[PDB]
Amino acid sequence: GICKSSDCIKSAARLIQNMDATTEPCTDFFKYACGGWLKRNVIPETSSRYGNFDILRDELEVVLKDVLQEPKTEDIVAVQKAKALYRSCINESAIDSRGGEPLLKLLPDIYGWPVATENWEQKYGASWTAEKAIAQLNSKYGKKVLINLFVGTDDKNSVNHVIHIDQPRLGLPSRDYYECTGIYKEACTAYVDFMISVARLIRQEERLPIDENQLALEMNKVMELEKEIANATAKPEDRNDPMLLYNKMTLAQIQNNFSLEINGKPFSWLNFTNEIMSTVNISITNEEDVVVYAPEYLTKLKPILTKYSARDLQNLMSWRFIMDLVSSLSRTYKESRNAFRKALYGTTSETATWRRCANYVNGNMENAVGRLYVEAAFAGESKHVVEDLIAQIREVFIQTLDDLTWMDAETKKRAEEKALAIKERIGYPDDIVSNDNKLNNEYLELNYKEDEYFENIIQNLKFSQSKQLKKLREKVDKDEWISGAAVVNAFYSSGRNQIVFPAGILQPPFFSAQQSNSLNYGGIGMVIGHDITHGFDDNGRNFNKDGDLVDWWTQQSASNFKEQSQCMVYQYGNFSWDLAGGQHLNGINTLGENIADNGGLGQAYRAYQNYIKKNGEEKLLPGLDLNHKQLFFLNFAQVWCGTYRPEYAVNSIKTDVHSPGNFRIIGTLQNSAEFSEAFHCRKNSYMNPEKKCRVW
Ligand SMILES: *[C@@H]1O[C@H](CO)[C@@H](O)[C@H](O)[C@H]1NC(C)=O
Ligand SMILES: *[C@@H]1O[C@H](CO)[C@@H](O)[C@H](O)[C@H]1NC(C)=O
Ligand SMILES: *[C@@H]1O[C@H](CO)[C@@H](O)[C@H](O)[C@H]1NC(C)=O
Ligand SMILES: *[C@@H]1O[C@H](CO)[C@@H](O)[C@H](O)[C@H]1NC(C)=O
Ligand SMILES: [Zn+2]
């Protein structure tokens, strides 16, 4: 009774290639499950990390290349535009011939880049106001600097949009980098050298004198300014409670409580907001309600901005925008970027042009590219079977509530209601394939010229920002997907109470109608459980069945949750990551993903046990002396096999919201008695500790 099919042999081969039977399962299951993987697969020169997910993403890019690179006679206007955008992106002849000219033509429209301008004060200094300069980058280009103003869903009224004020993103990956001492020194030095190189190239291209000493002074001052801004931002552990982050008030209250003097001019919040919303023909009064996510940042900004001139501020602001544009310019400009990416990520090589270009088109025309991808790569039978697996795991979560004693009967009822109201999205929205008209209308305003890639990306920035700002007075679309189809990932939205499984993740090793159901439950089954469990993690539990930020917990059940979850903060906090020079994981930053992993694997195992109880044991795999209980856990581990560069691991441990793959496997399996039963693990072996954490 061993499976004899081609598919079982190829499944068995894959499992055997990746594992290492010269390790004990109960000593380190990562090594046992992924030892073979780690010996075989090296981290590509273009990758900062590598694993099952990255390999599937590289393979997805090849499908996108193959469906984008050839015209077809029967292509609708949406597909033609996507293919025209791709062709403009890969034509490096046309891009190299234009040098930096497209950036030079644009710079006046953002009030210039002083370091790269002769007589900046005379040209722009007079007419310059923080309000107009920040609004312009925001409204026209989608770039948020100093003050992050955006139109988003109201946390407390999930059917409406509201204007948010938040701290902005930094030029370096996180605030920690702006210490610029020790492991960060390389990054900060490369960041300034990147600024100077682009400044030198713009000056050389406009035939201005290059004073090397002057470039250094100015760009070292941009870094000094951004050091203060970063130091003013709230830490991720102070932004992880959505109730304390929500602070609704009026533009009037804002004008009083968060006063700023910028360039010696009192900042007008009303002038700032109207500068942005006036681009979509919407007026704003002092009565306008606004969510402030970063009160303490705005307060710390006041003393900082007193010490800096318009010239100092625009040198930072314009640079933050130029950073995002370099990859759309000539070979020469991309050289300066590659050096900084090496210093930061440890990558020695630039990603293949056609890979970067496929990903750009997918990111900007997700429905058009999704349509092409699913026709090319996606079965159709997959949608039905996965919809069934989601049904089973959703019911397993609901049934599991009865076993959860630390929750009272009323909190159990509220949880079941949320679980029943979770909106599932599988593969792709049918309308991208079946409704040509709706898809065309989505991209109607977009008109791409094939010899103008830079004009094409600038048009894309205006299009996206326009669409987002003009939602302020509209209601949230309930039919909208939080992911395109050509994506190797899965998501939960607390605001929509929605789980998405794009076509990209519904392939081996996660899922196949052909592969064993033990592998399906251990792969996509655990991924389904994970994303359902996100609705009930330290963040998601604060939102109710309609995505409204409202406490549906008793004080006792809430205390109990914190108690249970605290176990997992300490468990993962005690993990020492050797690729990060033995630094400990941040148990608080990773808690959400850690709750989801532990919860998700348990839900998936129970669903598989129920599947067995009904449909009975299935045929073993040839060449593997393993039962199907063991294959479930083995596929789980192999789904998360991967490795990281020591360069982008000693840094990323402090900010990462996911645990590394090895601790995702070790952490969850340590907390599973079912794992230790399937591999008969001796009590107090590394993988079978006596203390086991659990929430869901
Ligand atoms: C690329 O651009 C060049 C220069 O503008 C143009 O002559 C050529 O037709 C384009 N080639 C392709 C393959 O699109
Ligand atoms: C950082 O901000 C705090 C107050 O928010 C201040 O005490 C400190 O001087 C700031 N600057 C640096 C370099 O830490
Ligand atoms: C904001 O103030 C500037 C002058 O500083 C003015 O030219 C502009 O029209 C104002 N914009 C709005 C939207 O009030
Ligand atoms: C490690 O676990 C111990 C015992 O549970 C706990 O006291 C400690 O806080 C944990 N360490 C970290 C860094 O989280
Ligand atoms: Zn997750």
Swiss-Prot record:
Membrane topology (Extracellular): 1-696
Catalysis: reaction(s): Preferential cleavage of polypeptides between hydrophobic residues, particularly with Phe or Tyr at P1'; substance P + H2O = substance P(1-9) + L-Leu-L-Met-NH2; substance P + H2O = substance P(1-7) + L-Phe-Gly-L-Leu-L-Met-NH2; neurotensin + H2O = neurotensin(1-11) + L-isoleucyl-L-leucine
Known cofactor(s): Zn(2+)
EC number: 3.4.24.11
Residue pairs linked by disulfide bridges in the UniProt entry: 3-8, 26-681, 34-641, 89-357, 180-188, 567-693
Entry keyword annotation includes Membrane: yes
Active-site residue numbers: 531, 597
Entry-linked PROSITE patterns: NEPRILYSIN (PS51885), ZINC_PROTEASE (PS00142)
Sites where a glycan is attached: 91, 231, 271, 574
Topology term for the membrane: Single-pass type II membrane protein
GO cellular component terms attached to this protein's record: axon; brush border; cell surface; centrosome; ciliary basal body; cytoplasm; cytoplasmic vesicle; cytosol
Domain Peptidase M13: 2-696
Note on cofactor: Binds 1 zinc ion per subunit.
Stored InterPro entries: MetalloPept_cat_dom_sf (IPR024079), Peptidase_M13 (IPR000718), Peptidase_M13_C (IPR018497), Peptidase_M13_dom_2 (IPR042089), Peptidase_M13_N (IPR008753)
PTM note: Myristoylation is a determinant of membrane targeting.
EC class (word): hydrolase
GO terms assigned for molecular function: cardiolipin binding; endopeptidase activity; exopeptidase activity; metallocarboxypeptidase activity; metalloendopeptidase activity; oligopeptidase activity; peptide binding; phosphatidylserine binding
Chief location: membrane
Disease note: Charcot-Marie-Tooth disease, axonal, type 2T: An axonal form of Charcot-Marie-Tooth disease, a disorder of the peripheral nervous system, characterized by progressive weakness and atrophy, initially of the peroneal muscles and later of the distal muscles of the arms. Charcot-Marie-Tooth disease is classified in two main groups on the basis of electrophysiologic properties and histopathology: primary peripheral demyelinating neuropathies (designated CMT1 when they are dominantly inherited) and primary peripheral axonal neuropathies (CMT2). Spinocerebellar ataxia 43: A form of spinocerebellar ataxia, a clinically and genetically heterogeneous group of cerebellar disorders. Patients show progressive incoordination of gait and often poor coordination of hands, speech and eye movements, due to degeneration of the cerebellum with variable involvement of the brainstem and spinal cord. SCA43 is a slowly progressive, autosomal dominant form.
Other facts: Important cell surface marker in the diagnostic of human acute lymphocytic leukemia.
Job of this protein: Thermolysin-like specificity, but is almost confined on acting on polypeptides of up to 30 amino acids. Biologically important in the destruction of opioid peptides such as Met- and Leu-enkephalins by cleavage of a Gly-Phe bond. Catalyzes cleavage of bradykinin, substance P and neurotensin peptides. Able to cleave angiotensin-1, angiotensin-2 and angiotensin 1-9. Involved in the degradation of atrial natriuretic factor (ANF) and brain natriuretic factor (BNP(1-32)). Displays UV-inducible elastase activity toward skin preelastic and elastic fibers.
Family as reported in the entry's similarity comment: Belongs to the peptidase M13 family.
Protein name per UniProt: Neprilysin
Species: Homo sapiens (Human)
Encoding gene (name): MME
